[PDB]
Symmetry: D2
Subunit: 295 residues, 4 copies
């Protein structure tokens, strides 16, 4: 036997960083969860019990803190590039670094119609993430994403015209609730190294804001023919707004809300046009994906 | 042996209800999770296998749907009173109903600086809850609450002057991060029955908004001497704003963010006044509670 | 306003302890999660920002480690009594200690039909817990419990004869799946202090083993008329086996497995006596409780 | 823009199946969670709102129930092959089916030293899984796995000789606790179709039992030089025992248990050779992976 692939590192490293404007007295906090996995010439640690090739996972954790201390942690696409680049340049036998970052929301509180200087609130569980792969001699691959964005529209969603055969019991509908947890990923064109990533810095936050806005507007306005059709429209718009993106990927659960027939109880009418009370279903759920790129 | 206490019912009943304004075309959704437990003369179901006294848990579930269909589901203190009252009046041998409701947020989306008629987003995992106990001949006891409100302030929090003995290693501090998940409960004065609850309807939503606002403002503005001191101030204000409240209860975790000493690495300064990078701690955590009432 | 009730302390303190037999070379591990909340004369910490009365939560955490170091951590009813007693004797103004302990399973591995000296496996998520309230001048109240015991029987469970009215749609049945997560608590008679608890040490583990065994045997053998009837039988037996127990409490979810009618598909028969494939339901679920004591 | 990749289907389909031996009266239950995602000529559902190409996710759910009704659900590698094969043969425009199955444990209860005919208990949260990809014209790819196997050894684990530089603070050790959650996957050689999978049926369960046993024995007996070294030894043995396996993959977290220095308290000795009380750390954790194949 032989080692076909190997990676190791530190997972679930929680990091918080505060920025203090001495001028204005305004404070800004950043909180994230970091994973860093390394690859290189480390086979002997597995095959020969040779630990000399191992950069201890505890040292990797130390390095994340130090890096966060000496560099900006935002935007995450930059911080992740700096962190991955560090491992491949510092260690001769390490040739790839895979860095995953999850940014948690800490939103400035508004007190009395005015932004508070140092108080924050977590508004929802929606995350902004980055996956950065830094490979010696192959540049920097970045995939940015937003996830945990949960939305629902109570009408203007349809589903009819689908295949019908002896396995089908689902009825066609012209009016239904559509609810989902949005997971959207945009993959950037490969970057030659850190200097190139630094040159595109302003595009990261703007592209994140754009993906979010397009996602929300398209969901709210589209008279949805299906989840498939609505998601393609979002992805089409994101690609058209940012040329440096190669592919957009969406992964959407269809969280079902079933009508409850109450007619067995005093002829109570609660179906079709009279539907008011529904039962949200925990499982199972439809799962719909699509990767859209440039023709 | 004998049955000293008994209750049974249906838990985790998810309910969704939509309101459609035919005039404006505006839709409003309500989503909640309901638990209903009953008590009464049901001992024989346990002792003698006598199921004749049992209102099937499946029937209790049916009843929640029917009740939601025929009545307003908001404010939750009213819907819960209606639901509990129903069981004790309908069934002769049922003398207490305990109804718990958790309201999930579905917040109208703003598209292009304007409220969307039928699209919603879950902004955070913060809940509004109610506990309603409807006891035959003893009226209606209601406890309302908000939970899952997660906040953090990066400065203006202190902790010094505490007891020091041979078990103490904690250092006094004049500047620290304060973060917590707020769980606040206000207990209403006992109500004689449904007609009395209906008479106070407008006070429910207003008191909920008040508890939230006071909680947020006090946390942000108080130069906190301790979690204990800050929570008492919140509770004091809520009691002063609403006379129909008998007691306010707060339960607050103190989620710790530790300084990271980086001086072993090139004399890097990251403690005290130079602290920028912290390590959020998952556990353990301080847990601080207090019940405040009227003197 | 005034402080009606107050308690504070440390939650989620994870503790591991290893015992090494120098003779046999056999090692035994104990892992638990501890919560300790204190009460006493601490009102001024809330009302006057007077921290002098506060035993820091960090010190409480230190104390748990020290106590675990100097005393046996098993059985948990003893360790919890020692820990609570410590706070009320050490601090003059602290009059009650509430200690909660959750024991996690680490079960000796069997390698080659033989017990391994120092390797363990977590077999299931079932917990053994204790709640200990140590109140100055009122002795020691202990509630022991087992939870997270998940079981299912595929037949020999019935449910018929229940009340039927206009809210009922559930059909009577003579054969069904019964599945639940067992939560059983036995409350001990009040103890005068530590010396009395020490005198009953051997009864703790034996009573825990007994509750478990009776729970499992009764569930498997009873031709269940209802969850209510089966749980009363368990509680009756536990009370008869241990006189020092005052009350047994059971709290049982009824996790439903619905039949799937497949007759719309080629007359496939999958209901009643032909039922083979079921759909486990995540929610909602029946919740059945009962507290049984001595007549 | 264009669709580069697309898949859709049903996730979280919970299925239970009971087998009743009319002879012996012995019942056997199987419980699983199934995901099925399809690919084929379905681009137009995204691009043109053409639902005619869509096999409704609800129909996919129906099909899982029907398939489970007409076929054995064990071993899971077979059931998954049958299910995936069904979609590609039945639908002309569907060319790949991806089926994921998670098997939950329901272990026959032993009552009075004897196997009970129809009562079961969930012993741990350990899963047996399968991933089956059925691609038209490319046969059947199966990856089997076990996950959620949580183990700990209190001694006979070392970690010394690792790289040391200015980022290192970790001390070398010759004696430590080693704890992890085992995730092991074995990939089978490609199968030509269902008839070939049926021919190897007996090898599935045996290979699963083998992977488990080797994993447990190697963990318990190896005087571990590192997680890397111990995992390679397991994978080496699995490959040697089953020729039809092409690659073994392990993914192991290193769950840390830190020593607690108690010397600041009365010179209490709790480090190195005197270590008895440890603090289990929730995060961060080391993450170590390796894919081992044939030379
Ligand atoms: N939008 C949408 N709804 C569905 N309901 C059942 N299947 C589907 C599907 O593929 N798409
Ligand atoms: N606010 C606050 N911080 C603490 N840190 C340690 N103990 C305490 C406590 O009781 N209150
Ligand atoms: N055992 C049992 N099954 C039920 N199914 C519906 N209600 C009940 C109940 O109260 N007990
Ligand atoms: N086994 C093991 N322990 C570690 N502790 C820190 N890093 C490592 C590592 O790579 N392997």
């Amino acid at each position: 036997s032989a080692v076909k692939a190997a990676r190791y590192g530190k997972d679930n490293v929680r990091v918080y960083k505060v920025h203090k404007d001495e001028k204005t007295g305004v404070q800004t906090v950043y909180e994230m969860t970091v994973c860093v996995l390394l690859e290189g010439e480390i086979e002997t640690s597995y095959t020969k019990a040779d630990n000399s090739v191992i950069v201890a996972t505890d040292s990797i954790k130390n390095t994340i803190y130090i890096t966060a201390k000496q560099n900006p942690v935002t935007p995450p696409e930059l911080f992740g590039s700096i962190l991955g680049t560090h491992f491949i340049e510092k260690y001769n036998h390490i040739h790839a670094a895979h860095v995953n970052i999850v940014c948690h929301r800490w939103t400035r509180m508004d007190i009395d119609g005015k932004p508070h200087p140092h108080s924050f609130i977590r508004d929802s569980e929606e995350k902004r993430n980055v996956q950065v792969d830094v490979v010696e001699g192959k540049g920097i691959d970045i995939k940015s994403s937003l996830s945990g964005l949960t939305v629902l529209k109570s009408t203007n969603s349809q589903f009819w015209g689908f295949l019908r055969d002896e396995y089908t019991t689902l009825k066609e509908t012209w009016d239904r609730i559509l609810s989902t947890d949005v997971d959207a990923t945009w993959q950037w064109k490969n970057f030659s190294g850190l200097q190139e990533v630094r040159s595109h810095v302003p595009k990261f936050d703007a592209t994140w804001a754009t993906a979010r806005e397009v996602t929300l507007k398209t969901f709210a306005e589209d008279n949805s023919a299906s989840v498939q059709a609505t998601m393609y429209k979002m992805a089409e718009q994101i690609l058209a707004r940012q040329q440096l993106i190669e592919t957009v990927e969406y992964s959407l659960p269809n969280k079902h809300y079933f009508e409850i027939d109450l007619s067995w109880h005093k002829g109570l009418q609660n179906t079709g046009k009279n539907a008011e009370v529904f039962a949200p279903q925990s499982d199972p759920n439809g799962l719909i994906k699509c990767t859209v790129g440039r023709s």
